[PDB]
């Protein structure tokens, strides 16, 4: 199964807004899914996640240092970070302890960005089918509400003077089978199977093929990126 990747443009934007390009902190890094992206624009990447299994499987890079730690207690030296990102949903974060930690590690002007993405879009025919899946067939099966990440962090209590983030999107070039594989990663798809014993992707596949046309043809698939960003400490 394949998953959307944050684009180079996101990391490039972080490289420009940061006060310098020395040190990036990846807060809740999982297995390094965004860490290598940061490494393109920042000299050192410090990546933390509390999950030992995630860190054990993390993708090695010469300039990325991983550690098992919560985002709120990184162990990093104070005043050592130019940018910090949380791009895996701020999972299990105590926001107020987290903000204290960012203030401790930040250099003057350092940027924090909470980053997520929204519902995949392809074209209007395919989107109608996806909308029926997401809002219709899976409506009872959405996972427990995570108000902040679901709002694109619009609702996140955010204590830092904010930047205006530019419009950005994830872009992939996927044939139908890759796109179905991706839909199969949604929590709601698993939950639907647990509840009904039926595969909702099998149910929608005829309609999806009709919308797709020739299933082997790769289409441009996008996801809109949502960012809430600001300066942790003043310049």
Give 60's contacts (C-beta < 8 A, 6+ positions apart): none
Q: Which sign, positive or negative, has the C-alpha torsion 136, 137, 138, 140? A: positive
Please state, in angstroms and as integers, the Cα–Cα distance from residue 42 to each residue in 121, 144, 179, following that order: 31, 35, 32
Angle at 104 between CA 97 and CA 225, to 5 degrees: 70
Beta strand 81-86 with 106-117 is parallel
SS (H, E, C) 187-206: HHHHHHHHHHCCCHHHHHHH
Fold of 119-142+175-218: Arc Repressor Mutant, subunit A (1.10.10)
Q: Is 113 in contact with 11 (CB distance < 8 Å)? A: no
- Token couple for 109: 């002007």
Ramachandran quadrant class, 32 (left: phi over 0; alpha: psi -120 to 50; beta: rest): left
- Token couple for 102: 């960012």
SS (H, E, C) the chain: CCCCCCCHHHHHHHHHHCCCCCEEEEECCCCCCCHHHHHCCCCEEEEEECCHHHHHCCCCCCCEEEEECCCCCCCCCCCCEEEEEECCCCCCCCHHHHHHHHHHHEEEEEEEEEEEECCCECCHHHHHHHHHHHHHHCHHHCCCCCHHHHCCCCCCCCCCCECCCCCCEEEEEECHHHHHHHHCCCHHHHHHHHHHCCCHHHHHHHHHHHHHCCCCCCEEEEEEEEEEEEECCCC
Region(s) of the chain under CATH 3.40.50.150: 1-118+143-174+219-235
The span from the CA of 116 to the CA of 132, in Å, is 22
The span from the CA of 47 to the CA of 55, in Å, is 9
In 174-186, which positions are buried (b, 16+ CB within 10 angstroms) versus exposed (e)?
A: bbbebbbebbeeb
Angle at 140 between CA 137 and CA 145, to 5 degrees: 125
The span from the CA of 113 to the CA of 106, in Å, is 13
- Of 33, 39, 32, the closest CA to residue 14 belongs to 39
The span from the CA of 103 to the CA of 28, in Å, is 17
- Of 82, 85, 80, the closest CA to residue 29 belongs to 85
Region(s) of the chain under CATH 1.10.10.2560: 119-142+175-218
CA 107, 24, 13, 121: dihedral to nearest 10 degrees? -140
Class of 1-118+143-174+219-235 in CATH: alpha beta
The span from the CA of 32 to the CA of 104, in Å, is 23
Q: Is 24 in contact with 14 (CB distance < 8 Å)? A: yes
Please state, in angstroms and as integers, the Cα–Cα distance from residue 85 to each residue in 45, 112, 130, 153, 156, following that order: 11, 6, 30, 13, 14
Give 136's contacts (C-beta < 8 A, 6+ positions apart): none
The span from the CA of 4 to the CA of 127, in Å, is 17
- Token couple for 183: 């839909």
């Amino acid at each position: 199964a394949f998953r959307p990747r944050y684009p180079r443009a996101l990391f490039r934007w972080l490289g420009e807004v940061a006060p310098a390009r020395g040190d990036a902190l990846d807060c809740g890094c999982g297995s390094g899914q965004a860490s290598l992206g940061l490494a393109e624009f920042f000299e050192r990447v410090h990546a933390v996640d509390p999950g030992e299994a995630q860190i054990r499987q993390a993708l090695r890079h010469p300039r990325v240092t991983y550690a098992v730690a919560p985002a709120e207690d990184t162990g990093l030296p104070p005043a050592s970070v130019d940018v910090a990102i949380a791009a895996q949903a701020m999972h299990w974060f105590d926001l107020d302890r987290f903000w204290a930690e960012l203030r401790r590690v930040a250099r003057p002007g350092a940027v924090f960005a909470a980053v997520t993405y929204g519902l995949t879009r392809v074209d209007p025919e395919v989107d109608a089918v996806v909308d029926r899946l997401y809002h219709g067939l899976l409506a009872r099966d959405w996972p427990p509400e995570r108000v902040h990440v679901e709002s694109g962090y619009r609702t996140l209590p955010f204590p830092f003077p904010e930047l205006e983030a530019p419009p950005l999107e994830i872009e992939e070039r996927w044939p139908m089978d890759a796109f179905l594989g991706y839909l199969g990663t949604w929590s709601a798809v698993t939950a639907h199977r647990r509840r009904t014993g039926a595969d909702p992707l099998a149910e929608i596949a005829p309609a999806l093929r009709a919308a797709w046309g020739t299933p082997e043809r790769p289409l441009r698939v996008t996801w809109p990126i949502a960012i809430r960003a600001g300066r942790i400490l003043p310049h």
